[PDB]
Ligand binder design. Structure first.
Ligand code: HEM
Ligand code: HEM
Ligand SMILES: COc1ccnc(NC2CCN(C(=O)c3ccc(C#N)cc3)CC2)c1
Ligand SMILES: COc1ccnc(NC2CCN(C(=O)c3ccc(C#N)cc3)CC2)c1
Ligand SMILES: C[C@H](O)[C@H](O)[C@@H]1CNc2nc(N)[nH]c(=O)c2N1
Ligand SMILES: C[C@H](O)[C@H](O)[C@@H]1CNc2nc(N)[nH]c(=O)c2N1
Lengths: 421, 421
């Protein structure tokens, strides 16, 4: 009736029942675990070419409506009944249905709340929702996206927000943001063979170039928004530079750190995921919260296939960068992490260290178990890329399952898209 | 026909087919992952009260014999046939069978090779095997265990070894080491309420005390061996102090580190696991390799429920131990890790840093895929407790499955044991 879960730091035990509401089969098999796979099909919601079979839709819609009304302090059965009926009718007369703004808001929060890989979920109920289900052109998308960036950035005082574009109709008119994230730096393969900027965006950068974007060949060139509306070919749009807030990296003691000429954007916005709710699918709905220091200090700046600055920082610290056992990498990466936090702080930009975030999640997870007997969590993603066991999340056993509403991954658009011309 | 696996640092792809040889259902379900569970039933091989049904044994024995002979450079079908027959007959006439020493050696290495949670597997073929399947008394066990400790310790030049005691017969005469590891420090709850030594061994310490062991109330009291032979009640045995090599912790710059009065044993020996091979089960077979710095520097010294020295080291470094975001914990734990490595090195004791170990495993995993198209690996256990993404293993997708031979966990003996008197 419940899965037993234990925290080996406190010895605390928790009983998980929420996993019963899980959906289709997860990642792992019966006699094999694929937990460390980044993009398993179980987390991907692909494209369709026909509407959702009414036999499948109705039940899901009924479930969501019940979940929605069941979330109120004081019930409202009459409204609940009426809503259940209005939806059934709309589905019969239109072959689909529309969510009320409140329903939409409710769904975006629950989906966030149901994100196994998100460590900032204690903030789940604090989300600004921008309703753009009325959008129809690429240009309109772009304006909505700019309004989102501006609202969220808030001149350093970051605010969590999400923009919901039109829901998938027949799957032939999907609104899609071809970008992985709203703000991201370009990556160029230079003439001399070296790579400039973020090597991670090499292909995508080229794609923008192929679509008429002008390469500026810098180390931190903010890529353009590639927008696809109503299923039409994607159009390119440069982001107004004024909208992109950046932080210059400075160390609180090493004056030579700024000599590294590094910086990073302040807005962490996921741009390519799909919001699934009550049978409906929103192929385009960018959302953001605020950065956790390690993403920049460790992944962006230290992954070898990214900006890869670890060795450089090593030498400038006078460490034995030629002997692994000297643990110079451990010393280097920490100073870098200290630089990131120090910088966002000095420039008054919202950011969170991984220690504080982990404790935050632990409190959240505990709240969730009391509140609903479960919290889908992916240990592999929740444990920071540094200081693993130093954080409490590391000693917490977790259960990973897919509920609904949910934020799914999607097949890269350029691999399934049918160009007009 | 194969599971696709990718390394996001090199972009390299690997095809896993070895997982086809997997056994019963693994940890995770169909629509739920329990990868972060420490002791799932899928990894535990419990007690029996009756022999292994011949219908189950024979097939397994046949498989192992085939695997064994199939591992030679130049085949030897005649011997292979003869062996297949001799085993079948032995099973029919005795209801079980005995492995040849070479078979046993082969099995202990493969089992090691098949350990998903072991990062030092590149050393798999380098293992000293002590055949104690002739043992019969607790006293004899103890002598074998002492010989193992002495051989493995080798005065600092650690050598990997395993001691195999009698295989389970009817499950009523199991040889069992009640200890989790051969060398481990006692933990005492003092009169004033504080805890002295290793809080992790509080219960077990009490159990030894209840069995007639004398508590020395020190911070580093090596617990006694609790041995169970031929299924009889466990007998206590103090380990000859001369056999336990220890390292005094010293920092290469902070002279006040030795003032912490810390030390740790040099021998990392797993004492409570069961070796499964060709249908046979060896409930007692301690084994060891050599330490990886982080186990001591991070888990033993920094886990809050263990020696918990992090804050202390923090203050002595003059860090802002009152502000998490200052990342003092990241700075403290690294100096501690540096202390551990520096100390084992100065005292000429074999030890490995986590960076070097990770690269070692990456090479191994690569070898394994070429050699046999797979390598069971548990990402959650293979990624060090610090410097996660700084190590290559972190960016490597992995498949976790149970093959055979295998090293299983067992139910704690004191929970299923039937005392004589
Ligand atoms: C308020 C502050 C927030 C913090 C500090 C936080 C932090 C994080 C971090 C560190 C990650 C890891 C990203 C990676 O490794 O690629 C993440 C992932 C994620 N977050 Fe949050 N988050 C916040 C808000 C949000 C919001 C507002 C939503 C949605 C409405 C959300 C949805 C997700 C999802 C779905 C993922 C998974 C991304 C993926 O699968 O690539 N987060 N978050
Ligand atoms: C030669 C050096 C070796 C190194 C550096 C190495 C390192 C490690 C490390 C760091 C762990 C993690 C332990 C924990 O977190 O509790 C581990 C686990 C393990 N090792 Fe190795 N190992 C070595 C040799 C061996 C040998 C000789 C065997 C067996 C014959 C072995 C079997 C295992 C098993 C089964 C585990 C899992 C333990 C558990 O589930 O609690 N290792 N090893
Ligand atoms: C939704 O709320 C939050 C809150 C805090 N962090 C995130 N992380 C996201 C992932 C990291 N992000 C990137 O842009 C990125 C992603 C990948 C690579 C590479 N290879 C390089 C950079 C910002 C968005 C989301
Ligand atoms: C087989 O080969 C190797 C090679 C390198 N490391 C290991 N690790 C093992 C686990 C760590 N070990 C402990 O004794 C221990 C275990 C648990 C706790 C606690 N709570 C405290 C201490 C040494 C054995 C095995
Ligand atoms: C292979 C590994 O699955 C992927 O490298 C990991 C682990 N955890 C992560 N955790 C977060 N939060 N973000 C990540 O990219 C990854 N990737
Ligand atoms: C909950 C978590 O499953 C357990 O804390 C973890 C993760 N990985 C580990 N990895 C190793 N190598 N040893 C461990 O004890 C643990 N425990």
């Amino acid at each position: 009736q419940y899965v037993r879960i234990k925290n080996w730091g406190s010895g605390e035990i928790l009983h998980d029942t929420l996993h019963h509401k899980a959906t289709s089969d997860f990642t792992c098999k019966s006699k094999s675990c694929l937990g460390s796979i980044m993009n398993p099909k179980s987390l991907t919601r692909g494209p369709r070419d026909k509407p959702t079979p009414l036999e499948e839709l109705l039940p899901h819609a009924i479930e969501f409506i019940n979940q929605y009304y069941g979330s109120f302090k004081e019930a409202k059965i009459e409204e609940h009944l009426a809503r259940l009926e209005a939806v059934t009718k709309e589905i019969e007369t239109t072959g689909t249905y529309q969510l009320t703004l409140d329903e939409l808001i409710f769904a975006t929060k629950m989906a966030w709340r149901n994100a196994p890989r998100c460590i900032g979920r204690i903030q789940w109920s604090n989300l600004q929702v921008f309703d753009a289900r009325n959008c129809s052109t690429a240009q309109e998308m772009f304006q909505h996206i700019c309004r989102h960036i501006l609202y969220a950035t808030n001149n350093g005082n970051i605010r969590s927000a999400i923009t919901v574009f039109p829901q998938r109709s027949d799957g032939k008119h999907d609104f899609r943001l071809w970008n992985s994230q709203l703000i991201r730096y370009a990556g160029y393969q230079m003439p001399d063979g070296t790579i400039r900027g973020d090597a991670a965006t090499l292909e995508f950068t080229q794609l923008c170039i192929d679509l008429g974007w002008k390469p500026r060949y810098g180390r931190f060139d903010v890529l353009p928004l590639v927008l696809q509306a109503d299923g039409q070919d994607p159009e390119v749009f440069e982001i107004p530079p004024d909208l992109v807030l950046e932080v210059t990296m400075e160390h609180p003691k090493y004056e030579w750190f700024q000599e590294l000429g590094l910086k990073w954007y302040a807005l962490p916005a996921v741009a390519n995921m799909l919001l699934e709710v009550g049978g409906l699918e929103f192929p385009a709905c960018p959302f953001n919260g605020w950065y956790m220091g390690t993403e920049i200090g460790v992944r962006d700046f230290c992954d070898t296939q990214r900006y890869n600055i670890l060795e450089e920082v090593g030498r400038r610290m006078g460490l034995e960068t030629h002997t692994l056992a000297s643990l110079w990498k451990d010393r280097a990466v920490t100073e870098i992490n200290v630089a990131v936090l120090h910088s966002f702080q000095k420039q008054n930009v919202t950011i969170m260290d991984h220690h504080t975030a982990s404790e935050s999640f632990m409190k959240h997870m505990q709240n969730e178990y009391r509140a609903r007997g479960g919290c889908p969590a992916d240990w592999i993603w929740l444990v920071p890329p540094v200081s693993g066991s130093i954080t409490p999340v590391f000693h917490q056993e977790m259960l990973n399952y897919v509920l609904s509403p949910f934020y799914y991954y999607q097949i890269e658009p350029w691999k399934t898209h049918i160009w007009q011309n």
